[PDB]
Structure formats: C-alpha cells, structure tokens
Swiss-Prot record, chain A:
It comes from Homo sapiens (Human). The chain holds residues 90 to 110 of 110 of the full protein. This is Insulin A chain. Disulfide bonds join 6-11.
C-alpha cells in the first residue's frame, strides 16, 4: 500500500496525487 | 516540491497538499 510504496521508494507530487482518488 | 521518501504524517499531509482535498467524508469508504 501507499505507506510502504512512498516510505520504501521516492514519491513526487506526480505520484502522491494518484492516491487521493 | 522536491524528491524525497515520505512516511506517516509527512506522507498524509503531502498527498493532501497536492490534492487540495481532505478525504475521510461522512460514512468513510476507504
């Protein structure tokens, strides 16, 4: 999930915006 | 913005800031 994906690898604003949907 | 790894409160605020919306509405769906 999002917490693993963005804490184990980089998340830009262009990646983070997808997870608001 | 600048590229970084993000966790917990830092992560939930960063996705709220790009989205411009809170989520977690009346009768939560996620």
């Amino acid at each position: 999930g999002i917490v693993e994906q963005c804490c184990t690898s980089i998340c830009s604003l262009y990646q983070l915006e997808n997870y608001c949907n | 913005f600048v590229n970084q790894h993000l966790c917990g409160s830092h992560l939930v605020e960063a996705l709220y800031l790009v989205c411009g919306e809170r989520g977690x509405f009346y009768t939560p769906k996620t």
